[PDB]
Paper text:
Cytoplasmic incompatibility (CI) results when Wolbachia bacteria-infected male insects mate with uninfected females, leading to embryonic lethality. CI is caused by linked pairs of Wolbachia genes called CI factors (CifA and CifB). Protein-binding experiments and expression of cif genes in yeast have shown that CifA binds its cognate CifB specifically and rescues CifB-induced yeast growth defects. CidBwMel consists of a region, which is predicted to contain two PD-(D/E)XK (pseudo) nuclease domains (residue 1-751; hereafter CidBwMelND1-ND2, ND: nuclease domain) and a C-terminal deubiquitylase (DUB) domain.
We determined the crystal structure of CidAwMel to 2.75 Å resolution. CidAwMel is made up largely of α-helices. Residues 111-154 and 158-165 are disordered and cannot be modeled, which divide CidAwMel into an N-terminal domain (NTD, residues 1 to 161) (see below for why we include these disordered residues as part of the N-terminal domain) and a C-terminal domain (CTD, residues 162 to 422). Interestingly, the region of CidAwMel which is disordered in the absence of CidBwMel (residue 111-154 and 158-165) is modeled to form a helix bundle upon complex formation, consistent with its role in mediating CidAwMel-CidBwMelND1-ND2 interaction. These residues are part of the N-terminal domain.
Residue numbers in the entry: 5 to 83, 87 to 110, 155 to 157, 166 to 276, 280 to 422
Write the structure that this text describes.
């Protein structure tokens, strides 16, 4: 495990891109990659790890924050330094049927069967190949089916990369929303799974089409109060877990929270009752992220403003309950014990300070 962990860090410290977010996205992609192929690389040494460097420092392999599997597979089949990885193991894993490594699943399969089987196997490189071999008519239907199947409660992290791929290849996200709404909380599970794996871009696209595109939405709210509140709580946890992607997580928090379609939900989230308020984790999450000192963070002022405006919004909706709101938040920040929180510092004081500024 220590060895496995070392492997992960070394492979991530080579990625460098001008945009911090793109890089961080890639460090995550590498993590996911290493998760899939850990056994192959388990026993390894630095010298053998340089082959993984020339293919990972090559921007050809990278398509945005994600990896171009086709290119990557080709690079994983060339025996400069030796491929310590087996060509056959990799070729099969990357569905390179032709140019089979030669000297498991991989026979010959029709497209639909392969698609339906690869998804069951949670084989991200498998679903992609078959998607290509699919008839154009059948494409959207097959993808939609996969999404519905994989947007399920008892899910796993592997499902998210496939879900990401399916959403990005859906050419009509309006019908997708509709086929998802038939499933119980099928829309929540799709967004929550993409959030946990930090596929923020995909979520933004979905939020823009499903919440911001039109005056119309048969329930006007695609999400419920619970799903709305859970989205924000889950986003605040990921933001504290991935401080380099906090800008993208903060923008998603604001877009969901301040959406006009969910304005009633926004007012309910700041209603303090029974010594609790649903925005506690989220408002506490932004405060902790704003006071982080282990990262060089530009625009801490913008972050402070969001916090202040969220506090001001709570005062404007229920002015009578504001002192209750202040006491609940201060007490929550003193016992929270969440990630990114510096131990031994009283975060309650920071809140008290924000409350005073508001008074003036």
């Amino acid at each position: 495990t220590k060895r496995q962990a070392e492997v992960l860090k070394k492979l991530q410290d080579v990625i460098k891109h001008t945009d911090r977010d793109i890089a961080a996205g890639r460090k995550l992609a590498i993590k996911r990659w290493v998760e899939t192929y850990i056994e192959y690389i388990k026993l390894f040494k630095d010298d053998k790890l340089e082959f993984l460097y020339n293919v990972f420092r090559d921007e050809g392999c990278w398509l945005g924050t994600r990896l171009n599997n086709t290119v990557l597979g080709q690079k994983l089949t060339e025996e400069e330094i030796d491929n310590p990885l087996p060509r056959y193991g990799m070729a099969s894993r990357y569905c390179i049927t032709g140019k089979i490594g030669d000297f498991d699943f991989w026979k010959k399969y029709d497209a639909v069967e392969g698609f339906d089987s690869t998804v069951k196997l949670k084989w991200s490189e498998g679903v992609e190949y078959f998607y290509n071999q699919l008839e154009e008519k059948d494409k959207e239907k097959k993808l939609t089916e996969a999404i519905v199947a994989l947007s399920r409660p008892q899910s796993v992290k592997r499902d998210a990369p496939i879900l990401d791929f399916c959403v990005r290849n859906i050419g009509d996200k309006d019908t997708l929303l509709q086929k998802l709404l038939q499933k119980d909380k099928g829309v929540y599970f799709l967004l929550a799974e993409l959030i946990e794996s930090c596929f923020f871009d995909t979520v933004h696209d979905l939020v823009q089409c499903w919440c911001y595109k039109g005056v119309s939405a048969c329930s006007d709210k695609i999400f419920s109060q619970q799903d709305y509140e859970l989205f924000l709580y889950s986003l605040s946890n990921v933001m504290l877990k991935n401080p380099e992607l906090s800008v993208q997580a903060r923008s998603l928090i604001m877009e969901i929270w301040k959406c006009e379609r969910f304005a009633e939900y926004r007012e309910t989230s700041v209603n303090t009752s029974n010594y609790t308020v649903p925005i506690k984790s989220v408002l506490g999450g932004l405060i902790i992220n704003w006071k982080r000192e282990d990262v060089c963070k530009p625009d801490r002022e913008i972050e402070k403003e969001e916090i202040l405006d969220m506090i001001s919004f709570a005062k404007g909706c229920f002015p009578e309950k504001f002192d209750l709101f202040k006491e609940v938040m201060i007490e929550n920040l003193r016992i929270c014990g969440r990630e990114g929180k510096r131990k031994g510092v009283d975060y309650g004081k920071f809140a008290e300070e924000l409350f005073l500024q508001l008074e003036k």
